[PDB]
Predict the structure.
Amino acid sequence: SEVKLENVTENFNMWKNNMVEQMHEDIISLWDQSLKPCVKLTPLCVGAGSCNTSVITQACPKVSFEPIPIHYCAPAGFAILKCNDKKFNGTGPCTNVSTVQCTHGIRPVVSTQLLLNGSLAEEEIVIRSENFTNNAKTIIVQLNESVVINCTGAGHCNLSKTQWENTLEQIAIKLKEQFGNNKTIIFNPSSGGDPEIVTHSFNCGGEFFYCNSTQLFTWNDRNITLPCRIKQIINMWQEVGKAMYAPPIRGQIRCSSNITGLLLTRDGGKDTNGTEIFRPGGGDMRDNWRSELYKYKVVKIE
Amino acid sequence: EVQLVESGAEVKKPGSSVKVSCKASGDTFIRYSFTWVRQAPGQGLEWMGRIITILDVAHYAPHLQGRVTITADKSTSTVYLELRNLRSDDTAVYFCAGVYEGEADEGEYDNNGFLKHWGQGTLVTVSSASTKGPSVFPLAPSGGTAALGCLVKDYFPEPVTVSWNSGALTSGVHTFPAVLQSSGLYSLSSVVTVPSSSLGTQTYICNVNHKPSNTKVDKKVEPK
Amino acid sequence: XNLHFCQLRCKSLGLLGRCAXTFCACX
Amino acid sequence: DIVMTQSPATLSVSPGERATLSCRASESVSSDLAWYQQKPGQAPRLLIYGASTRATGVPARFSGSGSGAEFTLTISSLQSEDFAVYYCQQYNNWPPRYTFGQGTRLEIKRTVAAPSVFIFPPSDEQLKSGTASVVCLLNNFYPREAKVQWKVDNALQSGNSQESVTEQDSKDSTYSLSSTLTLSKADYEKHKVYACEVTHQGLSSPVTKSFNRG
Ligand SMILES: *[C@@H]1O[C@H](CO)[C@@H](O)[C@H](O)[C@H]1NC(C)=O
Ligand SMILES: *[C@@H]1O[C@H](CO)[C@@H](O)[C@H](O)[C@H]1NC(C)=O
Ligand SMILES: *[C@@H]1O[C@H](CO)[C@@H](O)[C@H](O)[C@H]1NC(C)=O
Ligand SMILES: *[C@@H]1O[C@H](CO)[C@@H](O)[C@H](O)[C@H]1NC(C)=O
Ligand SMILES: *[C@@H]1O[C@H](CO)[C@@H](O)[C@H](O)[C@H]1NC(C)=O
Ligand SMILES: *[C@@H]1O[C@H](CO)[C@@H](O)[C@H](O)[C@H]1NC(C)=O
Ligand SMILES: *[C@@H]1O[C@H](CO)[C@@H](O)[C@H](O)[C@H]1NC(C)=O
Ligand SMILES: *[C@@H]1O[C@H](CO)[C@@H](O)[C@H](O)[C@H]1NC(C)=O
């Protein structure tokens, strides 16, 4: 036969993956179905532009919430492609593609600045961005070695100091590989915004933690104790608005997570050249999901 | 040092509306939640509603049908209770109360539903009756101990103060709680027991003070 | 996210305000 | 929705003795249960919260216990200042619909004291006004339960008399009650004998006090 055998290579775009919006909608459903606020205040506007605060009061039961691993499976008629290329930056064509019935097991965590309990890179650290040139595009950092962070809930979480320092070190190197070897890398704390954005915030065991992460993002070419506090009144992530959750059930609340990634932003401007500044980012949970689904692409079977 | 002071007594006509204020002082206002409790004469306490200051959200008791609104003014650190289309059975003492919720300004909130600090209360009388001083009639004694008194009749509104001999006579005195009559006016009696041997020797005068009508009367109670 | 309110607050600090999903972030 | 029922409605106990009040919720309220004390003419004071936590400034003789739908407030040694009304309150439901118990009045128990009865005919000054009030007085008796029967020309009356009872006396722990028979001058001058028959635990026989108009 003259016919030739060929592997089927598809094009990927982790930035325009419908699996992300789908998961985002699923996470939101699972939450409202298990952790709803006692009072929810959300802005309600009309055409002209006049708005009024909407207040919703409902039962807000609290129960020990344990991580339920989930994954996405292909419905009859479609298949889930998986890019297995090394250092896959998340876009363009993939040479070594495979198929799976469902995605790997995921333990979805809502957080900002740091990605917790996610998947690690097999080779070295990899940084991905929809457009590095654009300083308005978030940079997702996928570590290849997790860093344990334990919160004794006693108002502070602890991390290895040299291990976190080694992490910034390797991350900075990867940034040089993407912006220039002679450029100087510098990490600075958030420039501001809501507390969830300014601090490293995450939900653990159904509680909303806010940790001061200044000691973590102050660097330039033992343990690290971060001051953290639990809040009942916060800003929602599922939608714009404020909410109030019930006080903690258990007496002492602890939390042990693996730092598998980070969300950064680079300071733009043509000012002060030769150096790049990166601060902790995040806020749009879609990027949190995207950090786990970047290697998948659902395509119609044919 | 955390105290609650409420505005003075009020008298309203049916269909009118009243706004009671509660000034809070002594600590960070936004760190407390306030509740309004009412008590009709001779009845128990009733939870009306509670406002979560920092959030500026108030919750109410069922059967109120939006005739009540609870608001807070962070500027003056004052809580208000607005009651509309008042009915005569709205007459009661309204109590303002509050409790500490934690560092609400830092996002912490206990959402405690009990009441630690309380205001002195504000009497609100809803009636179509117009203020009127009381008519004081003598309850004259009809072999050693004699009883006499004064009938303080048809006055509006509460309260009324009664004393005997400018307060020098207190032993044996019994000033009864007032009774609201079918006419919408109040009425009560005040009696004292004295020794018969003192009659025709010492004078017994009951002093009746009704602030609302700025009336002050002294009636002599004779054996005749 | 509340862009309008976000922009004003960050602005009163010489920063630009922009949404970060449902949150306000100053740049 | 959540009904709080206190019992008994009235509790009588000797000073220095121990009293135990009961409160019940129509459904579990967990431990979001508080107890308050209120003196006549005064604002309520918070005694216990969290079902068993005693508030600052509250005497050590006051203590609460219970959980779910059964709670109790114990006052180990009744002092003169402890005789008043006590209310419980649940605040466990959300959306919040907090409710109070209808209360339990704690009164001083003393020995039976018969009352002295006195009847007062209306004054001429009131007659000139056009109304007529006949007052019957029951001075310093115990317990509070008493019965006043009005008779006009030996005819039992009903529906035209208002009674008023004082607070328990703080010097002899007795009570005083007044019964007022109201009529128009017209109806009053049409009758001759006005009498009030009194019945009380301390009286072996009803005590009747009366007068003849004129
Ligand atoms: C693709 O797989 C082959 C097979 O081992 C490997 O040699 C090659 O390095 C892989 N390329 C990428 C993009 O990972
Ligand atoms: C991503 O990788 C592809 C091919 O490896 C490359 O064309 C692209 O510039 C990289 N960065 C972007 C634009 O995401
Ligand atoms: C698929 O085929 C391409 C082209 O021959 C090759 O480069 C790639 O490594 C193959 N991937 C695998 C391992 O199937
Ligand atoms: C992780 O990657 C860094 C550089 O990105 C490298 O120095 C380190 O050896 C790698 N560790 C593992 C376990 O792959
Ligand atoms: C990436 O962003 C830069 C602006 O920083 C822009 O000039 C460039 O066109 C963008 N890349 C593409 C192809 O969209
Ligand atoms: C991370 O995973 C660990 C182990 O399952 C779990 O105890 C912890 O709650 C997770 N962290 C968060 C914030 O979900
Ligand atoms: C965090 O800690 C730093 C360093 O002590 C301090 O300057 C800052 O006010 C704290 N709050 C922040 C930035 O979240
Ligand atoms: C972090 O917490 C986990 C959970 O209890 C524990 O097993 C682990 O030993 C802790 N790691 C450190 C830094 O001691």
About this structure: Residues A 67, 107, 109, 116-117, 202, 204-205, 255-257 surround 2-acetamido-2-deoxy-beta-D-glucopyranose (ligand 6) (CB under 6 Å). Strands of chain C lie at 17-20, 23-26. Helices of chain C lie at 3-11. Chains C and B do not touch (no CB pair under 8 Å).
